[PDB]
PDB file of C-alpha atoms and ligand atoms in Angstrom:
ATOM      1  CA  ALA A   4     168.989  69.442 109.846  1.00 45.40           C
ATOM      2  CA  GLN A   5     165.500  69.767 109.510  1.00 42.55           C
ATOM      3  CA  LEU A   6     162.695  71.070 107.529  1.00 40.51           C
ATOM      4  CA  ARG A   7     160.746  73.900 107.646  1.00 43.15           C
ATOM      5  CA  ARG A   8     158.091  75.751 105.237  1.00 42.72           C
ATOM      6  CA  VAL A   9     159.458  78.567 104.216  1.00 41.51           C
ATOM      7  CA  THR A  10     157.297  82.290 105.116  1.00 42.16           C
ATOM      8  CA  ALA A  11     157.970  85.681 103.624  1.00 45.80           C
ATOM      9  CA  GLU A  12     160.080  87.228 106.844  1.00 44.26           C
ATOM     10  CA  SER A  13     162.107  83.922 106.693  1.00 47.08           C
ATOM     11  CA  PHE A  14     162.912  84.132 103.337  1.00 46.42           C
ATOM     12  CA  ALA A  15     165.907  85.897 103.558  1.00 48.30           C
ATOM     13  CA  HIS A  16     167.776  83.835 105.772  1.00 51.58           C
ATOM     14  CA  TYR A  17     167.599  80.516 102.961  1.00 47.76           C
ATOM     15  CA  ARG A  18     168.143  82.779  99.446  1.00 49.95           C
ATOM     16  CA  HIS A  19     171.334  82.610  99.216  1.00 51.47           C
ATOM     17  CA  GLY A  20     170.515  78.629  99.825  1.00 47.49           C
ATOM     18  CA  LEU A  21     168.305  78.059  97.555  1.00 45.60           C
ATOM     19  CA  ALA A  22     170.464  79.658  94.521  1.00 48.39           C
ATOM     20  CA  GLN A  23     172.646  77.453  95.195  1.00 47.73           C
ATOM     21  CA  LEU A  24     170.981  74.674  95.324  1.00 47.63           C
ATOM     22  CA  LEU A  25     168.505  75.419  92.329  1.00 49.83           C
ATOM     23  CA  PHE A  26     172.926  75.746  90.799  1.00 52.64           C
ATOM     24  CA  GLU A  27     173.732  72.386  91.845  1.00 51.16           C
ATOM     25  CA  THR A  28     171.257  70.776  90.575  1.00 50.86           C
ATOM     26  CA  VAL A  29     170.652  73.020  87.032  1.00 51.78           C
ATOM     27  CA  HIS A  30     174.845  72.026  87.291  1.00 53.62           C
ATOM     28  CA  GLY A  31     174.195  68.157  88.168  1.00 51.43           C
ATOM     29  CA  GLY A  32     172.304  67.935  84.838  1.00 49.17           C
ATOM     30  CA  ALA A  33     169.002  68.310  85.405  1.00 48.72           C
ATOM     31  CA  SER A  34     166.270  69.800  83.385  1.00 51.29           C
ATOM     32  CA  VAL A  35     164.819  72.554  86.331  1.00 54.85           C
ATOM     33  CA  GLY A  36     163.982  74.908  84.067  1.00 51.90           C
ATOM     34  CA  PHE A  37     167.331  76.682  83.463  1.00 49.01           C
ATOM     35  CA  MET A  38     170.714  75.821  80.295  1.00 44.31           C
ATOM     36  CA  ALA A  39     174.106  75.776  81.068  1.00 46.04           C
ATOM     37  CA  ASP A  40     174.909  78.629  81.243  1.00 47.48           C
ATOM     38  CA  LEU A  41     173.157  79.334  84.652  1.00 48.19           C
ATOM     39  CA  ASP A  42     175.499  81.461  86.937  1.00 47.01           C
ATOM     40  CA  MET A  43     174.687  82.272  90.842  1.00 50.04           C
ATOM     41  CA  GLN A  44     173.241  85.796  89.063  1.00 46.77           C
ATOM     42  CA  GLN A  45     170.424  84.090  87.340  1.00 46.01           C
ATOM     43  CA  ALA A  46     169.300  81.975  90.247  1.00 45.95           C
ATOM     44  CA  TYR A  47     169.054  84.676  92.731  1.00 48.42           C
ATOM     45  CA  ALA A  48     167.373  86.406  90.385  1.00 47.83           C
ATOM     46  CA  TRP A  49     164.718  82.545  90.020  1.00 51.03           C
ATOM     47  CA  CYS A  50     164.858  83.059  93.957  1.00 55.26           C
ATOM     48  CA  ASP A  51     163.670  86.947  93.831  1.00 54.78           C
ATOM     49  CA  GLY A  52     160.609  86.101  91.061  1.00 56.07           C
ATOM     50  CA  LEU A  53     159.157  83.809  94.525  1.00 56.52           C
ATOM     51  CA  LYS A  54     158.830  86.449  96.536  1.00 59.69           C
ATOM     52  CA  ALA A  55     155.457  88.180  95.506  1.00 59.55           C
ATOM     53  CA  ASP A  56     153.925  84.480  95.325  1.00 56.10           C
ATOM     54  CA  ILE A  57     155.162  83.059  98.842  1.00 55.31           C
ATOM     55  CA  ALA A  58     153.860  86.858 100.749  1.00 57.88           C
ATOM     56  CA  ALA A  59     150.508  86.392  98.913  1.00 57.49           C
ATOM     57  CA  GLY A  60     149.808  82.625  99.615  1.00 61.13           C
ATOM     58  CA  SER A  61     149.657  81.081  96.685  1.00 58.92           C
ATOM     59  CA  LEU A  62     153.506  79.556  96.664  1.00 60.28           C
ATOM     60  CA  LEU A  63     153.876  76.899  99.020  1.00 57.62           C
ATOM     61  CA  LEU A  64     158.160  76.699  99.992  1.00 55.36           C
ATOM     62  CA  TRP A  65     159.118  74.198 102.047  1.00 54.43           C
ATOM     63  CA  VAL A  66     163.907  73.306 102.223  1.00 52.75           C
ATOM     64  CA  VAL A  67     164.851  70.746 104.675  1.00 54.15           C
ATOM     65  CA  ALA A  68     168.531  73.176 106.644  1.00 52.88           C
ATOM     66  CA  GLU A  69     170.993  73.126 108.390  1.00 55.10           C
ATOM     67  CA  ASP A  70     170.423  76.349 109.681  1.00 55.60           C
ATOM     68  CA  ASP A  71     171.310  78.250 106.701  1.00 57.61           C
ATOM     69  CA  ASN A  72     172.199  75.555 105.362  1.00 57.23           C
ATOM     70  CA  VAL A  73     170.195  73.901 102.720  1.00 54.67           C
ATOM     71  CA  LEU A  74     170.321  70.593 101.413  1.00 54.69           C
ATOM     72  CA  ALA A  75     166.644  70.519  99.192  1.00 54.80           C
ATOM     73  CA  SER A  76     163.776  71.951  98.779  1.00 53.63           C
ATOM     74  CA  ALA A  77     159.731  71.328  96.997  1.00 51.17           C
ATOM     75  CA  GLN A  78     157.495  73.599  96.029  1.00 50.24           C
ATOM     76  CA  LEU A  79     153.632  73.838  96.101  1.00 48.94           C
ATOM     77  CA  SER A  80     151.758  75.990  93.642  1.00 46.84           C
ATOM     78  CA  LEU A  81     147.776  75.991  94.449  1.00 43.91           C
ATOM     79  CA  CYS A  82     145.794  76.091  91.893  1.00 44.50           C
ATOM     80  CA  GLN A  83     143.950  80.019  92.655  1.00 43.93           C
ATOM     81  CA  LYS A  84     140.583  79.445  89.431  1.00 45.01           C
ATOM     82  CA  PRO A  85     137.745  79.308  91.417  1.00 47.89           C
ATOM     83  CA  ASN A  86     136.951  75.958  89.302  1.00 43.28           C
ATOM     84  CA  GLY A  87     140.820  74.505  90.907  1.00 42.84           C
ATOM     85  CA  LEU A  88     140.385  74.457  94.206  1.00 43.54           C
ATOM     86  CA  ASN A  89     140.486  70.712  94.176  1.00 47.03           C
ATOM     87  CA  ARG A  90     144.426  70.445  92.671  1.00 47.04           C
ATOM     88  CA  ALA A  91     147.631  72.036  93.014  1.00 46.53           C
ATOM     89  CA  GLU A  92     151.003  71.407  91.055  1.00 47.90           C
ATOM     90  CA  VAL A  93     153.992  70.696  92.450  1.00 49.76           C
ATOM     91  CA  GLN A  94     157.378  71.944  91.288  1.00 51.98           C
ATOM     92  CA  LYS A  95     161.241  72.804  91.711  1.00 48.46           C
ATOM     93  CA  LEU A  96     162.179  69.281  94.510  1.00 44.34           C
ATOM     94  CA  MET A  97     165.213  69.165  94.524  1.00 45.39           C
ATOM     95  CA  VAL A  98     168.312  67.978  96.412  1.00 42.59           C
ATOM     96  CA  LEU A  99     171.325  69.129  95.941  1.00 39.46           C
ATOM     97  CA  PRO A 100     173.453  66.047  94.144  1.00 39.61           C
ATOM     98  CA  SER A 101     175.783  65.463  97.466  1.00 41.46           C
ATOM     99  CA  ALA A 102     173.027  64.430 100.070  1.00 39.30           C
ATOM    100  CA  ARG A 103     170.954  62.447  97.452  1.00 39.01           C
ATOM    101  CA  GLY A 104     170.045  58.896  98.567  1.00 40.06           C
ATOM    102  CA  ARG A 105     169.546  59.779 102.360  1.00 42.53           C
ATOM    103  CA  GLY A 106     165.743  60.113 101.904  1.00 40.26           C
ATOM    104  CA  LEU A 107     165.544  64.101 101.166  1.00 42.75           C
ATOM    105  CA  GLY A 108     163.011  63.765  98.265  1.00 40.40           C
ATOM    106  CA  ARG A 109     160.885  61.737 100.291  1.00 42.33           C
ATOM    107  CA  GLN A 110     160.787  63.472 104.072  1.00 40.20           C
ATOM    108  CA  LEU A 111     159.752  67.169 101.642  1.00 43.01           C
ATOM    109  CA  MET A 112     156.774  65.561  99.849  1.00 40.03           C
ATOM    110  CA  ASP A 113     155.356  63.986 102.903  1.00 42.74           C
ATOM    111  CA  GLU A 114     155.017  67.368 104.633  1.00 39.37           C
ATOM    112  CA  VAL A 115     153.459  68.418 101.414  1.00 36.66           C
ATOM    113  CA  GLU A 116     150.953  65.864 100.251  1.00 39.88           C
ATOM    114  CA  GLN A 117     149.932  66.765 104.230  1.00 39.73           C
ATOM    115  CA  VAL A 118     150.028  70.551 103.392  1.00 43.20           C
ATOM    116  CA  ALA A 119     148.284  69.567 100.662  1.00 44.24           C
ATOM    117  CA  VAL A 120     145.899  67.465 102.422  1.00 39.84           C
ATOM    118  CA  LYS A 121     145.550  70.168 104.851  1.00 42.95           C
ATOM    119  CA  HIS A 122     144.133  72.850 101.971  1.00 47.15           C
ATOM    120  CA  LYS A 123     141.273  70.130 100.784  1.00 48.99           C
ATOM    121  CA  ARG A 124     143.706  69.857  97.291  1.00 46.13           C
ATOM    122  CA  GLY A 125     143.079  66.408  96.615  1.00 45.12           C
ATOM    123  CA  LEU A 126     144.655  66.914  93.242  1.00 44.03           C
ATOM    124  CA  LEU A 127     148.672  67.129  93.229  1.00 43.45           C
ATOM    125  CA  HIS A 128     149.726  66.264  89.664  1.00 42.52           C
ATOM    126  CA  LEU A 129     153.234  67.403  88.372  1.00 41.30           C
ATOM    127  CA  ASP A 130     156.140  66.724  85.241  1.00 41.77           C
ATOM    128  CA  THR A 131     159.331  65.966  84.796  1.00 40.09           C
ATOM    129  CA  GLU A 132     161.821  64.921  82.401  1.00 39.33           C
ATOM    130  CA  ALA A 133     161.637  61.982  81.662  1.00 39.57           C
ATOM    131  CA  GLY A 134     163.661  58.677  81.621  1.00 45.85           C
ATOM    132  CA  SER A 135     165.495  61.175  85.042  1.00 47.33           C
ATOM    133  CA  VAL A 136     166.098  59.908  88.227  1.00 49.06           C
ATOM    134  CA  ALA A 137     163.400  62.595  89.475  1.00 44.41           C
ATOM    135  CA  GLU A 138     161.077  59.411  87.389  1.00 45.14           C
ATOM    136  CA  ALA A 139     161.939  56.917  89.346  1.00 43.17           C
ATOM    137  CA  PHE A 140     161.512  58.929  92.575  1.00 44.55           C
ATOM    138  CA  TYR A 141     157.907  59.501  91.519  1.00 44.73           C
ATOM    139  CA  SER A 142     157.400  55.750  90.485  1.00 44.73           C
ATOM    140  CA  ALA A 143     158.662  54.596  94.137  1.00 47.79           C
ATOM    141  CA  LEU A 144     156.407  57.687  95.924  1.00 51.71           C
ATOM    142  CA  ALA A 145     153.594  55.791  94.276  1.00 53.78           C
ATOM    143  CA  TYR A 146     152.193  58.540  91.631  1.00 53.05           C
ATOM    144  CA  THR A 147     150.558  56.973  89.137  1.00 53.58           C
ATOM    145  CA  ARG A 148     152.477  58.407  85.796  1.00 52.98           C
ATOM    146  CA  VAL A 149     149.524  59.476  82.978  1.00 54.47           C
ATOM    147  CA  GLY A 150     152.221  59.661  80.314  1.00 55.19           C
ATOM    148  CA  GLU A 151     154.634  62.330  78.310  1.00 54.95           C
ATOM    149  CA  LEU A 152     154.655  65.480  76.253  1.00 59.30           C
ATOM    150  CA  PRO A 153     157.328  65.189  73.379  1.00 58.16           C
ATOM    151  CA  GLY A 154     159.764  68.241  73.199  1.00 57.98           C
ATOM    152  CA  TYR A 155     159.131  69.964  75.707  1.00 57.76           C
ATOM    153  CA  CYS A 156     161.974  71.659  76.392  1.00 56.11           C
ATOM    154  CA  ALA A 157     165.684  71.449  76.501  1.00 52.77           C
ATOM    155  CA  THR A 158     168.382  69.216  78.994  1.00 55.16           C
ATOM    156  CA  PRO A 159     170.980  72.317  79.943  1.00 56.82           C
ATOM    157  CA  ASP A 160     173.168  71.316  76.695  1.00 56.68           C
ATOM    158  CA  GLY A 161     170.329  72.525  74.287  1.00 57.88           C
ATOM    159  CA  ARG A 162     168.896  68.453  73.555  1.00 57.53           C
ATOM    160  CA  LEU A 163     165.171  68.483  73.451  1.00 57.73           C
ATOM    161  CA  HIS A 164     162.926  66.030  75.790  1.00 59.72           C
ATOM    162  CA  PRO A 165     159.322  64.699  76.899  1.00 57.20           C
ATOM    163  CA  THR A 166     158.535  65.515  80.113  1.00 57.03           C
ATOM    164  CA  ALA A 167     156.691  62.780  81.949  1.00 55.11           C
ATOM    165  CA  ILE A 168     152.908  64.021  84.043  1.00 51.83           C
ATOM    166  CA  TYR A 169     152.349  62.407  87.825  1.00 50.04           C
ATOM    167  CA  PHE A 170     149.802  62.447  89.843  1.00 47.43           C
ATOM    168  CA  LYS A 171     148.432  61.420  93.348  1.00 46.95           C
ATOM    169  CA  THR A 172     144.563  61.834  94.400  1.00 46.86           C
ATOM    170  CA  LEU A 173     145.479  62.001  97.837  1.00 47.02           C
TER     171      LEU A 173
HETATM  172  C1  ACO B 201     157.743  68.640  90.190  1.00 47.68           C
HETATM  173  C2  ACO B 201     158.841  68.421  89.996  1.00 47.68           C
HETATM  174  O1  ACO B 201     159.414  69.124  91.185  1.00 47.68           O
HETATM  175  S1  ACO B 201     160.080  67.223  88.826  1.00 47.68           S
HETATM  176  C3  ACO B 201     162.567  68.038  89.279  1.00 47.68           C
HETATM  177  C4  ACO B 201     162.507  66.589  89.846  1.00 47.68           C
HETATM  178  N1  ACO B 201     163.804  67.055  90.422  1.00 47.68           N
HETATM  179  C5  ACO B 201     165.259  66.651  89.678  1.00 47.68           C
HETATM  180  O2  ACO B 201     165.014  65.996  88.459  1.00 47.68           O
HETATM  181  C6  ACO B 201     166.386  67.204  90.261  1.00 47.68           C
HETATM  182  C7  ACO B 201     167.740  65.905  90.325  1.00 47.68           C
HETATM  183  N2  ACO B 201     166.888  65.162  91.426  1.00 47.68           N
HETATM  184  C8  ACO B 201     167.086  65.171  92.713  1.00 47.68           C
HETATM  185  O3  ACO B 201     167.600  66.566  93.119  1.00 47.68           O
HETATM  186  C9  ACO B 201     166.860  64.039  93.139  1.00 47.68           C
HETATM  187  O4  ACO B 201     167.288  63.109  93.037  1.00 47.68           O
HETATM  188  C10 ACO B 201     165.363  64.181  93.213  1.00 47.68           C
HETATM  189  C11 ACO B 201     164.122  65.136  94.475  1.00 47.68           C
HETATM  190  C12 ACO B 201     164.376  63.889  92.586  1.00 47.68           C
HETATM  191  C13 ACO B 201     165.567  62.676  94.961  1.00 47.68           C
HETATM  192  O5  ACO B 201     166.386  62.841  95.696  1.00 47.68           O
HETATM  193  P1  ACO B 201     166.014  62.466  96.994  1.00 47.68           P
HETATM  194  O6  ACO B 201     166.135  63.208  97.709  1.00 47.68           O
HETATM  195  O7  ACO B 201     168.447  61.437  96.759  1.00 47.68           O
HETATM  196  O8  ACO B 201     165.070  60.880  96.908  1.00 47.68           O
HETATM  197  P2  ACO B 201     164.855  59.425  98.198  1.00 47.68           P
HETATM  198  O9  ACO B 201     166.174  58.929  98.457  1.00 47.68           O
HETATM  199  O10 ACO B 201     164.009  60.828  98.627  1.00 47.68           O
HETATM  200  O11 ACO B 201     163.630  58.767  96.702  1.00 47.68           O
HETATM  201  C14 ACO B 201     163.854  57.571  97.790  1.00 47.68           C
HETATM  202  C15 ACO B 201     163.260  56.456  96.912  1.00 47.68           C
HETATM  203  O12 ACO B 201     163.264  56.672  95.880  1.00 47.68           O
HETATM  204  C16 ACO B 201     163.513  55.956  94.071  1.00 47.68           C
HETATM  205  N3  ACO B 201     164.858  56.613  94.140  1.00 47.68           N
HETATM  206  C17 ACO B 201     165.559  57.684  94.353  1.00 47.68           C
HETATM  207  N4  ACO B 201     167.203  58.210  93.653  1.00 47.68           N
HETATM  208  C18 ACO B 201     167.366  57.372  93.057  1.00 47.68           C
HETATM  209  C19 ACO B 201     168.016  57.419  91.640  1.00 47.68           C
HETATM  210  N5  ACO B 201     168.875  57.925  91.427  1.00 47.68           N
HETATM  211  N6  ACO B 201     167.820  55.350  91.340  1.00 47.68           N
HETATM  212  C20 ACO B 201     167.087  55.120  90.922  1.00 47.68           C
HETATM  213  N7  ACO B 201     165.816  55.613  92.000  1.00 47.68           N
HETATM  214  C21 ACO B 201     165.845  56.232  92.734  1.00 47.68           C
HETATM  215  C22 ACO B 201     163.932  55.163  96.213  1.00 47.68           C
HETATM  216  O13 ACO B 201     162.824  54.346  95.644  1.00 47.68           O
HETATM  217  C23 ACO B 201     164.838  55.335  96.750  1.00 47.68           C
HETATM  218  O14 ACO B 201     164.247  54.492  98.179  1.00 47.68           O
HETATM  219  P3  ACO B 201     165.464  53.542  98.631  1.00 47.68           P
HETATM  220  O15 ACO B 201     166.484  54.980  98.355  1.00 47.68           O
HETATM  221  O16 ACO B 201     165.191  52.677 100.009  1.00 47.68           O
HETATM  222  O17 ACO B 201     165.927  52.517  97.386  1.00 47.68           O
END
């Protein structure tokens, strides 16, 4: 199982594995953008909407994989505004339910942070469901908690919940 940065040219190889990861993460209960009715048709559409920012270089995408089998993934959105070059937003960090607790989340974030540094990004920020396993995760990775935004998004079943803002100065 290896970590690879995905390009526009290698995307096709991981597209299916990435849609299944999103699929299992959503139905595992996480708030990562979708509802309980997400099916593979919609996961594929999510994957296809990533292709252009990945080809344009503003969205970096990684996966931890066994060939085409994707066990986890992480993305970094490089801010492109003329006064925001010092920052980037971590998003879509996900690990198959069955492969959790084995350190994959952390192997991804360590890559993300090192590439962030190689792209002169002094600031990494993100938001994630308040009270979720993702909170203890970022905290363990020494990300600082800013606080919450109430009713930020709904859980896959409809319930409104807050998101919690975290950051890391690299
Ligand atoms: C911007 C963002 O991406 S927000 C999206 C966040 N993603 C999600 O909520 C998706 C659902 N969750 C997941 O896919 C996973 O649980 C992730 C990505 C949050 C990370 O999970 P894993 O890959 O299994 O984490 P990993 O084992 O690398 O975490 C390392 C440390 O984090 C902490 N940790 C991980 N899982 C947990 C948990 N369930 N409870 C408490 N602490 C935990 C621990 O400190 C752990 O060190 P340890 O194993 O010695 O105790």
